[PDB]
Amino acid sequence: NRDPASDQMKHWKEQRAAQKPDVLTTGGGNPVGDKLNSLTVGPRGPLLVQDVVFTDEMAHFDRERIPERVVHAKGAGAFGYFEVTHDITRYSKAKVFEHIGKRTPIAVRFSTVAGESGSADTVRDPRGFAVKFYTEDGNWDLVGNNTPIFFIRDALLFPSFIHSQKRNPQTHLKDPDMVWDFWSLRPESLHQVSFLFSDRGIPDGHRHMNGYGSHTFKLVNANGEAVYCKFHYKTDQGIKNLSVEDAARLAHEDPDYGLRDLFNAIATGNYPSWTLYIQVMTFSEAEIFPFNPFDLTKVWPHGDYPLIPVGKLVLNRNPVNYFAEVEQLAFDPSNMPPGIEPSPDKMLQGRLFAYPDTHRHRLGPNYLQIPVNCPYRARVANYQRDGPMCMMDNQGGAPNYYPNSFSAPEHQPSALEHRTHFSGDVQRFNSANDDNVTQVRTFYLKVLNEEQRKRLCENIAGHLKDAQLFIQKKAVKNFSDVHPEYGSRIQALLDKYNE
Amino acid sequence: NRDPASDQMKHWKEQRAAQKPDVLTTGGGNPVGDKLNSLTVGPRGPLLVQDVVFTDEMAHFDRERIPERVVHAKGAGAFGYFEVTHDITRYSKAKVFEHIGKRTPIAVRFSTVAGESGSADTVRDPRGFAVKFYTEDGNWDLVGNNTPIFFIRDALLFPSFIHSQKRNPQTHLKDPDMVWDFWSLRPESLHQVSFLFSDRGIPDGHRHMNGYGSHTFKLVNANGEAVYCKFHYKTDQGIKNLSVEDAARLAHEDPDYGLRDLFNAIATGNYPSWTLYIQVMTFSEAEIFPFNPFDLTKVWPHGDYPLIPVGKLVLNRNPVNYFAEVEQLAFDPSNMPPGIEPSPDKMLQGRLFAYPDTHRHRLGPNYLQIPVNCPYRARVANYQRDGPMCMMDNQGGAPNYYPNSFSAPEHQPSALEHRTHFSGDVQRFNSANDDNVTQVRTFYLKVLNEEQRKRLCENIAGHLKDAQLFIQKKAVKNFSDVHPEYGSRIQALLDKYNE
Amino acid sequence: NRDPASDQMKHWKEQRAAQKPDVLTTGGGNPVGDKLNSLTVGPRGPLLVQDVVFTDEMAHFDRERIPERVVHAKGAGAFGYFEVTHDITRYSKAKVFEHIGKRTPIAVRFSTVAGESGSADTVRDPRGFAVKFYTEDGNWDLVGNNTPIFFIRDALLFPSFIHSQKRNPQTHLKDPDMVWDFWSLRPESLHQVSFLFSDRGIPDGHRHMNGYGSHTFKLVNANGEAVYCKFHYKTDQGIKNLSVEDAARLAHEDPDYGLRDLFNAIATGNYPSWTLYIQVMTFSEAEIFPFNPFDLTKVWPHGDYPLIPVGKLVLNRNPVNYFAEVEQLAFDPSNMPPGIEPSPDKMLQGRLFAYPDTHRHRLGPNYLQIPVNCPYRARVANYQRDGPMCMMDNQGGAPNYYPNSFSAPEHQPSALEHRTHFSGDVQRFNSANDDNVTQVRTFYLKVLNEEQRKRLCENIAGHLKDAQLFIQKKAVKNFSDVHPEYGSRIQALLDKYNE
Amino acid sequence: NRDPASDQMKHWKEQRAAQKPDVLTTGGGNPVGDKLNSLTVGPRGPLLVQDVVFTDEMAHFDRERIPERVVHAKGAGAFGYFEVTHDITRYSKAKVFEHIGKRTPIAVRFSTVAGESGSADTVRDPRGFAVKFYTEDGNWDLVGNNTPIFFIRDALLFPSFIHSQKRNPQTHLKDPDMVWDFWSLRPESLHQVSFLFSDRGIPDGHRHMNGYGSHTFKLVNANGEAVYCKFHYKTDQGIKNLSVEDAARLAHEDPDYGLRDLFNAIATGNYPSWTLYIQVMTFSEAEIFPFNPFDLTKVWPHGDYPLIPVGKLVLNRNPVNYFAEVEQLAFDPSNMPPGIEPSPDKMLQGRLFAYPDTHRHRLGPNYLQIPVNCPYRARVANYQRDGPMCMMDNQGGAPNYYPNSFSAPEHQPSALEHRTHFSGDVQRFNSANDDNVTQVRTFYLKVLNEEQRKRLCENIAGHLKDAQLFIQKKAVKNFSDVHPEYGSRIQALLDKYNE
Ligand code: HEM
């Protein structure tokens, strides 16, 4: 006998006891007489159109694939619940935080960023950690990563950043020139690049890394008072990372290391968990913060803004069918219930649009009707209708226009968003020159120790060495801006690689 | 007060009892606070991306439409049941005919042919009369028309025929030159054209016309014996047609005449019904038939092949949501349960491919998972997986390959198709001259009387007059081939027009 | 010999002189030996999968249709040019207005609003009048209507308004209750309703109606100075409308009356033209205008803001293939070149998102690559890549990320948008009660005369009579709010109708 | 200076030197002022819907991905020419073989089979080797592999086979139970499995392997005479394979080894070539062949059917944009010009349908209009029209129905397919027992030597050891049927593995 993941089929068979196998049918439900031999004219004659068993099956096979996620294509999913352990109702009226002991079902998907569906799990890259809470007030999607920050601070640079991390448009090869030219030209990336090339760049599976909302969000209480916050979900299994050596080995040995690690852990009752915390910053404090409180390349020092306990995230259920439950999972940062709102963070603002948008393309206009994406703990009632692949009853014969005099769904003023005053010109304000080095300096010499600083520089050099010399120079200049030694150590390694 | 159709909303509100209106939500289930005013900075300021209530709703509105059916786009639907009244098990082992009194739920869609979704119901055109039987052996789709024959006998001419009946590729206008150039060049169309321009060309609604499978089909019994057949479902409401004058009036007064007529008939309890019959031809008989038994431009004389009663079709339920239940309805001639099979009819053979093919395009790869199309009376089990908008559980974790040693779905030898012998070279046999006038002559001279013939010729000439003279001549020549008087009567009217 | 439209094919043939017919091929370019007879085993045998001539052609036929436009589905198109006749460079720096005599190619599509693709042209409804200018600074899409105003003033009510003007979700029938319940609940619609039910509700074809941008826009000159404007393009053919009786008759005699009239006019050299004017309002004046200058239900009095001539629009070319050049035509209000920008108009703001969004759905992600939609007079260069149906070279091997050090495209500061100042809270400001009667009263009493008011009320009553009494009462109540007589005249007709 | 592939951007910049960078525009051609900072109200304010530069770019990014190929997803492409070297016009009248020295442009795509888009190039798996010939008689697609045979002989087993080779439905992990359960239950796979697990299972890049049509095809000469044939294209750069150890290290060091190798070879002028040969078998010989001459699990012995030289395939041009020219490449086995036809091979018959079908889904209905897929050396002219993303002029105003009296395209009888006679009942003939070992014995004992035979068993055991014992037993049983020592050697290693 072997690991549970390996015995997937064996277990499916034994669980079907002595039940006779079902009758094999066409998509239309017609029993099939023989699905192993095609309908031909004579033993060695041509195939007939009349063989609709063949066409029915082949036509479906021909349409099995859907486009992969534009980013975070390689991933793993699991399900479980969220449980409130502490009272934060003074900050947010969100039903999900309603009362201690309150449980809400959740869906989670882990993933890498740049690699396609067939890529390896154990590679250096940020890690997606999206959590879907099916609440009474609809779904709340906390689409986070294994890092509290990111490489850029304005959504207009996202497509270009992703492109630079992907393949060359002509050769279809990973291109260090594209990678470092972009990062060297955009030093705001220094903070996350430092995180990326540290030990945390390659977590050991998905159970040994933390999750972060990254962005500054807004919480609103029952009295309509608002504060800004940040979400943190620390792994209860402890932080564990893979060495560059073992990561590379597993890259070919088991491209799906993260997938099987998670499935087996849950299958054996070793359910992984995370503790959800929040940091709170009042509007007054946000106006005095030394940097842009809504700058995604910045963190909120824990000493000034301590973590507040909220609850626990537990994954105790594996998907039964990956494609249906994980490949089709759709997380939308715009999916926020009353009590939780976005901040003016330029990046988050862009994500408000991008996710539902790419989902309408990747899955389809009615992707929210796919079981895993349905807010099944809520009652979806509105004036939206039709669209391709419309399931259910399309809200039946209910009046489809609002307002109406026929008792159809009514909006609820209780759900109105919190109001903030803004004053300024409609312009494209430059954020390229906000502080790009201060917090990186503290990360380098305060957060990391001597051994991980050495590893950090070797990891960077090992990749930067493949870029052109003028790019290497520019990149080293930025690192030096953070700290002379940071750049010096990298430069020293580059001179070696450069023979 | 008013007719049931007009009081649709009034009724929905009443059936709603005095319930409180549901809370209006986004597609994600999030309650909306005010869905009548957009989120802006200041009363006369710009719209925010932050307004996700707006985007959610507008994006779905922007995707409401799907491609209309390439043909038969304008239609009406209803639901009911098929009840067996006679025993024909000696001919077919199909479970649908299993025992007297057995009822099978059905779905039916009526339609015109050439017009697009916004066209009028009361126009001269054949009428679609598709019936979906949800049987224990899967769905059986009998996709018939209100005529036992058709204009052509080879599917390769179908796209061209339809193009000729639709809009000119440049002007987007109906084109009599296209219509008659095609018909005059393909005389095999004379039989259906005669029927089309007779009074039956414009039935009074959908309840006063007969239905026909048109094609010759094959029935197989428990002993594996087979016979050919024709399906006939006669209106119990009686044949009734609209005069050209009334149809033209209704065309603008109520372009949805047929839709309204059917909804109200059912809503008032005046359920329309049809009596299903079959004609049976043994294989020996098919070998001696004066024409090709599988030629779609010909009928089987009732005198030589008497109608055998089978059961009744009753429509007693209106759709609740038209888009979900009627617009998305998909009938596939290839959906046939054991006991019912196709004949060599070249046209039918082409249809075996065409419908599932167009449905995967118009609806989606997984169109059979749409509620109204699901064979909900059968257990769908096979090795098909994934595809866009994959609902349910995608068959969970069941082994997905066949054969397998894990108890997944299995054949069913009894379902094997009836084996027939065919001999001959594989080539394109010309069927253009398979007698295009004999049966047309009997229709013109015996089926119709004097006043009917006069109207028939007046209807033809009224439309053919707009074609070029050379086309008029070629058309008249064909009619003359059916009968000299047929031609001269039309010619005399044409001369009066060409004045 | 008939009209040009009727002789479309006749002319195509004559055009090919003695030139020999092309060889008929498959989509893959393989010559076809016989496209009239399918490949079978014996003259009365089954169809073979081997007949790839059949499958290739049928598979395409099965995919001919695309989703029709969610609104304005029924239309006609033509091409021509825009010629500058006056200098307005003091207001806008747009290249399209660069110098007197400058010509810019244009594409125009006329249409109704509610009817689907098969509906009739001569029905009461607003008329779409979209103009695409292919300028050196990209495409400028002025998506106007034949009216200066609209039914609503906030985009959140648009889907609802459209739903109310379309078919009942259960019966699929036009619904007077839906139409009037919505309008009676939203009095802001009074202005456009009065316009819609006046003689201008049914123009005589597309050449005898004016065009308007409707919304207030912003013009920016070379010195960075800005002013608000309104676009007006008056028909040089004169205003001409159809009587209700003639329109009803044509509804069935020629559903494509508008299409035919436009094609023949151009084919005979009787090219239609419109004179383009603009109204100008300074930011100072906008500050004290009696109404919200960005309220789409309001017009700017010509007495206070006279029309300033700009140029002429002339249509002198008929499309060659309707599907490729008209059905696939896509206009995005967001397509605005430097010198032209949007105003705060909530409705216009919503349209900035909706059109490109619906186009990605209806046509495809790369719909801007469809020839008629390509900004062929500009050099498209950016960092966008891939997507389905990617044509041309997909920008070859050019660096695909910005910024870069490899000489790829650069943004141009001179194209920066004009900066406007805004201040206020972020909230949903109610605009439901922004004076819904003042201008309506002026229209009713001044713009119209006794004869015109008589028909107006008869037209309204003729439709409103089919709504429930409680809806009729509320509707009449709003009309009385405009003017007592407006409501009483309608009420008198209603009483007669209700018996 | 590095390899050409690495200097892709460097070179693009240089070859553009002496040119000012282009203006960065939106998709609509509107120049952008600042594509690096989003439009907000105030420096730290909300993102505006008015930022259409952002929406236009992000919306396109959100739609960059299309479904990957259902199989053969990971690949590399290149272009070149086919040059005739010998005269085979006695066998085929195809224009592509017309005269010695004649050149026809070609497009080629190499690939693995099971892995997704992000998978490694150097893994054990068959290799795709598809060639598209742009001939004057349309495109001819020779969709070959690097092996002359395949695992199964009936298309109905293909989807199951591919499913067994891919990921487990629930775990999403490679599953040896699925792999070997299928192969052990279907011993016809022994021949190809033996080839797969031999040294040829992991080619050193794409230049050091052969290509085969695999299937028996049919050639028809100018006199209407036909013969059956096999296509063979041998590498001119010699057969070379990767050791299991080196392929494994390359899997993580360079997962795109094959792409890189091909691009650099061509970039440096080391153009790879292959010699195209054919084997000929007369209809008489096919009647007495010791096996089914159309059985894909069989080869035609060279001794009895020697290879006849035809021409050379030379690749001398790299793609300029991978996505447009390679990812979108579509090869349809059904694309065959006059002189080349299919054989009764059950697998080929199925492929005639599957490729165009999957292409309509993966790429779109009009995928043949994508530049790289267009039969640009031919003249496409037919009666097909419209469909989404319709490019070109959609054949303008040409009559769209056939037959017609207006001089539109006509079929050419000389292109009629060769006629063949087939006798026997039309039914599903079992082919599961068509000698599964005879040629496998020859391969094992005669083709391979002791060393490679040793590695063969080690390779099989290394993978088979992960399957359940009952599956191992059945698998070994099959190998023993080929030759007791074959199964014996594997069982020995298996025992050591099972420890
Ligand atoms: C009944 C058997 C088979 C079926 C139904 C089948 C089906 C498919 C499908 C659906 C694709 C994806 C096409 C695309 O998306 O572009 C594909 C690709 C491919 N198949 Fe098959 N296949 C079969 C057998 C084979 C055989 C025997 C060969 C070789 C002689 C072969 C060689 C290939 C190649 C090379 C490609 C990749 C083409 C490219 O590079 O785009 N297939 N096959």
CA dihedral C423, C424, C427, C431 (to 10 degrees): -90
Residues in CB range of C243: below 8 A, 6 or more apart: none
D72 is a catalytic site residue: yes
Q: Beta A128-135 vs A103-111: how paired, if at all?
A: antiparallel
String of b and e for A268-302 (b: at least 16 CB within 10 Å)?
eeeebbbbbbbbbbeeeebeebeebbbbbbbbbee
Q: How far is CA C372 from the centre of its chain?
A: 16
Tell me the torsion sign for CA atoms A155, A157, A160, A164. negative
In 3D space, the residue among D360, D409, A39, D382 whose CA is nearest the CA of residue B349 turns out to be: A39
For residue C403, say if its preceding peptide bond is cis, omega within 30 degrees of 0.
yes
Residues C160 and C251 in one domain: no
CATH number for position D497:
1.20.1370.60
Residue B353 lies in a domain: yes
Q: Are residues A160 and A205 in the same domain?
A: no
Same domain membership, residue D268 and residue D156: no
Q: Residues C446, C449, C452, C458: is their CA dihedral positive or negative? A: positive
- Rounded to whole angstroms, what are the CA distances from D298 to A292, D142, D190, D345? 70, 19, 11, 11
Per-residue tokens: C58 = 């049928």
| CA separation for the pair C399, C407 (Å, rounded) | 8
Residue B155, domain member (yes or no): yes
What are φ and ψ of residue B195, in 5° steps? -65, -45
| Residue D478 CA: distances (Å) to CA of A143, D458, D460 | 51, 16, 13
| Contact assessment for residue C37 and residue B430, using Cβ atoms and an 8 Å cutoff | yes
Residue C433, Cβ neighbours under 10 Å: how many? 8
- Resolution, Å (one decimal): 1.9
3-state secondary structure A400-423: CCCCCCCCCCECCHHHCCCCCEEE
Is D429 in CB contact (< 8 Å) with chain B?
no
Same domain, B120 and B33: no
Judge residue D99's burial from the number of C-beta atoms within 10 Å of its C-beta, 0-12 exposed, 13-18 middle, 19 or more buried: exposed
Write the DSSP assignment of A224-240 as a string of letters: S-EEEEEEEEEETT---
Q: A186 CA to chain B: closest CA distance, Å?
A: 26
Residues with CB under 6 A from ligand 1: A 62; D 69-72, 75, 109, 111, 128, 130, 143-145, 150, 155, 158, 214, 329-331, 347, 350-351, 354-355, 358-359, 362
At D194, which helix (H) or strand (E)?
A: helix D190-196
Nearest-5° angle of CA B394, CA B400, CA B404? 150
| Rounded Cα–Cα distance for residues B47 and C140 (Å) | 21
Determined by which method?
X-ray
Give contacts of C169 with chain B, Cβ < 8 Å: 321-323
- What is the token pair recorded at B277? 């019959």
What is the C-alpha to C-alpha distance for residues B235 and D480, in angstroms, rounded to an integer?
Answer: 68
Q: Do A51 and A36 meet the contact criterion of CB atoms below 8 Å apart?
A: no
**Pairing of the two strands A421-428 and B40-41:** unpaired
Q: Is B1 exposed, middle or buried (0-12, 13-18, 19+ CB in 10 A)?
A: exposed
Q: At what angle do helices B158-165 and C52-61 cross, to 10 degrees?
A: 30
Q: How many CB atoms lie within 10 A of CB C465?
A: 17
- Nearby residues of C277 by Cβ (< 8 Å), 6 or more positions away: C231, C232, C233, C234, C307, C308, C309, C310
Could you tell me if A196 and A161 lie in one domain? yes
- State the sign of the Cα–Cα–Cα–Cα dihedral B2, B6, B8, B9: negative
Which residues of chain C are within 8 Å of residue D22 when distances are taken between CB atoms? 379, 381, 408-410
Question: For residue D474, what are its two tokens?
Answer: 């059945």
The closest CB to that of B319, out of C60, C170, C432, belongs to C170
- The reply to whether C361 belongs to the active site is no
Q: Which value, in Å, is the radius of gyration of the alpha carbons in chain D?
A: 26
Helix axes B450-464, B176-185, angle to 10 degrees: 120
Whether the Cβ atoms of residue C35 and residue B156 lie closer than 8 Å to each other: yes
CA-to-CA separations, D277 to A273, C409, D227, D298, D313, in angstroms, rounded: 62, 48, 15, 18, 11
Output the six-digit token pair for A342.
Answer: 């976005």
In a domain, C157, yes or no: yes
SS3 D249: helix
Q: Quick count: other Cβ atoms within 10 Å of Cβ B103?
A: 14
Q: Are residues D171 and D122 in the same domain?
A: no
**Collapsing DSSP states into helix, strand and coil, what is residue D11?**
helix
* Lookup: tokens for D390: 């319709």
Q: What is the 3-state secondary structure (H, E, C) of chain B?
A: CCCCCCCHHHHHHHHCCCCCCCECECCCCCECCCCCCCCEECCCCCEECCCHHHHHHHHHHCCCCCCCCCCCCCEEEEEEEEEECCCCCCCCCCHHHCCCCCEEEEEEEEECCCCCCCCCCCCCCCCEEEEEEEECCEEEEEEEECCCCCCCCCHHHHHHHHHHHCECCCCCCECHHHHHHHHHHCHHHHHHHHHHCCHHHCECCCCCCCEECCCCEEEECCCCCEEEEEEEEEECCCCCECCHHHHHHHHHHCCCHHHHHHHHHHHCCCCCEEEEEEEEECHHHHCCCCCCCCCCCCCCCCCCCCCEEEEEEEEEECCCCHHHHHHCCCCCCCCCCCCEEECCCHHHHHHHHHHHHHHHHHCCCCHHHCHHHCCCCCCCCCCCCCCCCCCCCCCCCCCCCCCCCCCCCECCHHHCCCCEECCEEEEECCCCCCCCCHHHHHHHHHHCCHHHHHHHHHHHHHHHCCCCHHHHHHHHHHHHHHCHHHHHHHHHHHHHHCC
For D:396-425, CB contacts with C below 8 A are 396-399, 402-403, 406-417, 422
Name the residue range of residue B450's domain: 150-200+436-499
In sequence order, what DSSP letters do the residues of D20-57 get, joined into one string? PPPBPB-TTSPBPS-TTS-EEESTT-PBBTT-HHHHHH
Look at residue C417 and tell me if it is in a domain. no
Question: Which residue, chain included where needed, has tokens 């392997």?
Answer: D209
Contacts of C357 in chain D (CB under 8 A): 59
Q: Indicate the SS3 state at residue D443.
A: helix
Which atom of ligand 1 is nearest the CA belonging to D348? 1
Instruction: Report how far residue A374's alpha carbon sits from residue A354's, in angstroms, rounded to the nearest whole number.
Output: 19
Q: Name the active-site residue from D1, D30, D72, D318.
A: D72
Cis peptide before C365 (omega within 30 of 0): no
Q: Are residues B77 and B131 in the same domain?
A: yes
**Residue D189 domain-assigned?**
yes
Q: How far apart are CA C455 and CA B147, in angstroms?
A: 46
**In degrees, to the nearest 5, what angle opens at C-alpha B430 toward C-alphas B426 and B435?**
135
Contact criterion met (CB below 8 Å) for D73 and D65: no
In terms of domains, do C293 and C338 share one?
Answer: yes
What tokens were used for C434?
């922004």
Is residue D193 within 8 A of residue D109, CB to CB? The reply is: no
User: Distance between CA A209 and CA A203 in Å, rounded?
Assistant: 6
Same domain, A245 and A206: yes
Counting the structural domains of chain A, the total is 3
Q: Which candidate, B318, B319, B273, places its Cα nearest to that of B83?
A: B273
Rounded Cα distance, A478 and C466, in Å: 74
**A421-428 and A128-135 beta bridge pairing:** unpaired
Q: Which amino acid is it at C437?
A: V
Both tokens assigned to C211: 């065009």
Of residues B154, B103, B475, the one with CA closest to residue B344: B154
Q: Classify burial at A450, counting beta carbons within 10 Å of its beta carbon; exposed 0-12, middle 13-18, buried 19 or more.
A: exposed
Interchain contact, C12 vs D399, CB within 8 Å:
yes
CB D153 within 8 A of CB D301: no
Give a yes or no: residue B389 inside a domain: no
3-state SS assignment for residue A110: strand
Position of tokens 């298996």? Answer: D494
Distance from CA of D356 to the nearest CA of B (A): 12
- Please state, in angstroms and rounded to a whole number, the distance separating the CA atoms of residues A35 and D156: 6
**Are D186 and D476 a contacting pair, CB within 8 Å?**
no
Q: Is residue B83 part of a domain?
A: yes
* Two structure tokens written together for B414: 């009894």
CB contact under 8 A, A335 and B28: yes
Greatest extent of chain B over all pairs of C-alpha atoms, in Å? 85
Amino acid at D117: S
Q: Select from C374, C395, C412 the last residue of a domain.
A: C374
Please state, as a whole number, how many other Cβ atoms lie within 10 Å of the Cβ of residue B118. Answer: 23
CA dist., res. B328 & res. C287, Å (int):
51
Instruction: Compute chain A's Rg from CA coordinates.
Output: 26
Residue B364 sits at φ, ψ, to 5 deg, of 155, 165
What would the two tokens of residue B127 be?
A: 């009428």
Residue from B336, B331, B313 nearest B372 by CA? B331
3-state SS class at D408: coil
| Amino acid at the residue D495 | D
Residue type, A100: I
d(CA B374, CA B357): 17
Cα dihedral B175, B176, B179, B185, rounded to 10, equals -130
Distance CA D212, CA D195 (A): 14
- Buried b / exposed e over C436-445, threshold 16 CB at 10 Å, is bbebbbebbe
State whether D84 and D41 are in the same domain: no
Helix (H, G, I), strand (E, B) or coil at C362: helix
- Spacing of C-alpha C326 from chain mean position: 12
Environment class of residue D433 by beta-carbon count within 10 Å: exposed (0-12), middle (13-18) or buried (19+)?
A: exposed
Q: Helix or strand or coil: residue D384? A: coil
Q: How far apart, in whole angstroms, are the C-alpha atoms of residue B80 and residue B94?
A: 19
Which residue from B181, B401, B420 is facing D160, i.e. has the nearest CB? Answer: B401
- Measured between alpha carbons, how far is B482 from B436 in angstroms, rounded to an integer? 8
Closest residue by Cα to residue D39 from B54, A344, A421: A344
Q: Which atom of ligand 1 is nearest to the CA of A62?
A: 10
Residues D499 and D443 in one domain: yes
CATH code at position D2? 4.10.91.20
As a whole number of angstroms, the distance between CA D126 and CA D161 comes to: 13
In terms of phi and psi (left: phi > 0; alpha: psi -120 to 50; beta: otherwise), the region of A321 is: beta
Euclidean distance between CA atoms D480 and D491, whole angstroms: 10
Dihedral pair phi/psi, residue C473, rounded to 5°: -60, -50
Distance from CA of C367 to the nearest CA of D (A): 7
Alpha carbons within 13 angstroms on the beta-carbon side of residue A201 total 22
- Asked whether D145 and D351 are in contact (CB, 8 A), the reply is no
Mark which of C20, C37, C65 sits at the end of a domain: C65
Q: Which of A26, A329, A55, A366 is nearest to B374 (CA)?
A: A26
Q: Exposed, middle or buried: residue C143 (CB in 10 Å: 0-12, 13-18, 19+)?
A: buried
Instruction: Taking each helix axis as running N to C, give the angle between helix D158-165 and helix D176-185, from 0 to 180 degrees, rounded to the nearest 10.
Output: 150
D292 falls within a domain? yes
Distance from C-alpha of A358 to C-alpha of D65, rounded to nearest angstrom: 10
Contact C423 A421 (CB under 8 A): yes
Q: Are C366 and D27 in contact (CB under 8 A)?
A: no
Checking DSSP bridges between strand B424-428 and strand B138-145, what pairing results, if any?
unpaired
Residue nearest to atom 5 of ligand 1 (CA): D351
**Residue of A109, A173, A254 best to disrupt the D interface, most CBs of D under 10 A:** A173
Residue A211 and residue A222 share a domain: yes
Bond prior to D306 in cis (omega within 30° of 0): no
